[PDB]
Design a protein around this ligand. Structure first.
Ligand SMILES: [Cl-]
Ligand SMILES: [Cl-]
Ligand SMILES: [Cl-]
Length: 129
């Protein structure tokens, strides 16, 4: 479970779609500051990082329940990658940039309760406007 989560970040870190492909599933859902990605689209996200050449640096992390919060510096912006793992598999990912700690805590709470991606997205939208 820890490995799943960490490898996901390392894929971002390293710009490695091949690695991402290993730990996601067709059911994986991701929200990147509002926009939605399902399954193999998460892999394409990593291609965009690599085929752009800005460096993602995993700085530090926390586990809360089944939710991991990774604090990434992007070359600096504070990016946050929040991950719900379930059964060896990444279920939900939220990526945010330069948001308040309250938003991170609120999103983590929603994810802990296995809220659908629709609710996660609407909740973000209400908070960022
Ligand atoms: Cl999609
Ligand atoms: Cl809150
Ligand atoms: Cl809240």
């Amino acid at each position: 479970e820890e490995k799943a989560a960490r490898l996901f970040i390392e894929a971002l870190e390293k710009g490695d779609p091949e690695l991402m492909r290993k730990v996601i599933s067709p059911d994986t859902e991701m929200l990147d500051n509002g926009r939605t990605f399902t399954g193999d689209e998460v892999v394409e996200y990593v291609k965009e990082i690599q085929k752009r050449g800005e460096q993602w640096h995993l700085r530090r992390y926390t586990k809360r329940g089944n939710v991991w919060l990774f604090e990434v510096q992007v070359d600096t912006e504070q990016w946050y990658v929040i991950i719900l793992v379930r059964n060896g598999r990444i279920k939900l990912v939220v990526i945010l940039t330069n948001v308040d700690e309250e938003i991170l805590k609120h999103m983590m709470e929603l994810m802990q309760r296995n809220v659908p991606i629709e609710e996660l997205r609407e909740q973000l939208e209400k908070m960022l406007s």
